[PDB]
């Protein structure tokens with residue numbers, strides 16, 4: 377409405393993830409920045425999803441979602457997920473759906489990690505629904521997390537501005 | 553309880569922010585990874601805070617908080633915020649509290665950005681409270697956001713493993 381840099385930009389750069397929803401013929405994927413962990417034990421996550429997203433419809437329908445973690449190498453698939461709508465986009469995507477362990481929603485095999493979630497809350501704040509999901513299963517690529525921490529060579533993906541992305545430095549600073 | 557890499561590590565690396573709470577004598581700061589935007593218009597944020605944090609007490613008391621954005625250069629102050637407890641830590645911190653525009657909670661002048669929040673919800677999920685706040689005012693450093701986007705030279709801070717941190721590459725990938 378009022379040109380200027382919107383206030384949400386102050387939290388950026390933010391990690392970019394993929395959200396998978398539905399199953400079989402209805403299987404969808406969208407990009408999502410607005411994701412965070414909300415509890416350590418039980419493991420619970422949340423994602424802000426606008427009502428207008430096909431992903432919002434599929435999450436409400438089935439009560440499950442998958443957070444797949446993409447690398448910088450699949451930015452093209454990530455961009456499609458973030459720009460096109462609903463399950464027909466998968467026919468432009470370089471992605472392989474594999475079953476998941478506890479949700480019906482599929483996982484993305486190229487993903488660094490897939491986090492399988494059962495929805496336990498849905499609150500409305502402003503123009504998005506915050507979908508809170510209990511992590512009931514997870515898979516990942518061993519090298520991307522080899523020392524029980526994230527391996528920075530794996531090219532974890534972040535978002536700076538609308539069409540611009542970056543990964544992390546490989547230079548680590550120790551706090552103690 | 554069961555040694556192994558905990559499931560929350562799969563979302564990492566995550567941005568690290570500071571949370572400011574209370575005012576005057578009660579002014580506190582803690583580190584917080586688990587922060588995300590939940591709405592664009594109105595601008596609304598959320599932060600997962602364990603009940604055991606002094607910050608949890610101060611947020612419930614006053615209903616306000618500030619998300620300050622730290623750079624890699626102040627990792628030492630950030631580590632103190634994330635390791636010590638309650639307002640006495642400020643006497644080890646290289647930080648200058650300045651007033652805020654709409655909350656009573658102060659801002660951190662060295663911060664790349666301070667995001668002034670009025671609490672509008674508090675839900676409990678697992679071992680944390682998710683504090684949802686309406687952004688009612690904000691300030692930032694112009695060079696850190698010079699092109700209306702984040703300036704990567706500013707050294708935005710991220711968290712890889714318990715005591716390890718990194719910033720972003722300055723190398724930008726265009727998605728279109």
Ligand SMILES: Cc1cc2nc3c(=O)[nH]c(=O)nc-3n(C[C@H](O)[C@H](O)[C@H](O)COP(=O)(O)O)c2cc1C
Nearest residue numbers: 406407408409410425426429430431458460461462
């Ligand atoms: C990097 C990036 C991050 C995004 N993050 C979110 C998000 O956090 N929440 C949201 O509702 N939409 C987000 N979007 C928008 C959706 O990904 C995009 O609108 C998508 O076309 C919706 O697809 P769908 O209708 O198939 O679900 C994002 C887009 C991009 C490119």
Ligand SMILES: Cc1cc2nc3c(=O)[nH]c(=O)nc-3n(C[C@H](O)[C@H](O)[C@H](O)COP(=O)(O)O)c2cc1C
Nearest residue numbers: 582583584585586601602605606607634636637638
């Ligand atoms: C990098 C980092 C991130 C942190 N993130 C969070 C968080 O998201 N939520 C939380 O409750 N505690 C978090 N903590 C823990 C608090 O910052 C830490 O326990 C602090 O000592 C609590 O201080 P207080 O008791 O003065 O509030 C984090 C600590 C570090 C070092």
Ligand SMILES: O=Cc1ccc(O)cc1
Nearest residue numbers: 408409410425426535538
């Ligand atoms: O760019 C990130 C983004 C977040 C939420 C949206 O609704 C759309 C885009």
Ligand SMILES: O=Cc1ccc(O)cc1
Nearest residue numbers: 584585586601602711714
């Ligand atoms: O390391 C990040 C962190 C998040 C939540 C906590 O409660 C403690 C630490």
